[PDB]
Ligand binder design. Structure first.
Ligand code: IZ7
Length: 130
């Protein structure tokens, strides 16, 4: 939709703090810190797919809005995820071991803006069309 496309990461603020707050260890945080992934968003019928591609790590989810799904995250957490569309924002929550984190994806001007929150840490990552 407004989201459909191939998106390249162009900026990131506070991602190391976000990963630390999730409990990611040094080696895995090193792999994520300077990565500049592509995010490929597609839709078919009821199913939305978000691919994340980077040199040292690829991930993929496919989901239906409002339907919980199991997810293995890039840092190897086993989480329960639910994604909804609220005011044009794709809102994802991951729940595991009594914790939660949110990942909100929105379109702003030429940007796909992704806000990631864990506790008091907020990370902002911006992608632009490849
Ligand atoms: C790049 O992918 C990685 C990697 C490589 C590492 C090590 C990671 O460790 N923890 C996480 C989480 C993580 C991610 C996904 C990034 C996000 C969900 C941020 C929002 C976005 O930009 O989609």
């Amino acid at each position: 939709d407004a989201f459909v496309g191939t998106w390249k990461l162009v900026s990131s603020e506070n991602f190391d703090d976000y990963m630390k707050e999730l409990g990611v260890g040094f080696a895995t945080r090193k792999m994520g810190g300077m990565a500049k992934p592509n995010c490929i968003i597609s839709v078919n019928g009821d199913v939305i797919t978000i691919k994340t591609e980077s040199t040292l790590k690829n991930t993929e989810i496919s989901f239906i809005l409002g339907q919980e799904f199991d997810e293995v995250t890039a840092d190897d957490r086993k989480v329960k995820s639910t994604i909804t569309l609220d005011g044009g924002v794709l809102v994802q929550v991951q729940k595991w071991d009594g914790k939660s984190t949110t990942i909100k994806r929105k379109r702003e001007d030429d940007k796909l803006v992704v806000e990631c929150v864990m506790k008091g840490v907020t990370c902002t990552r911006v992608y632009e069309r490849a």
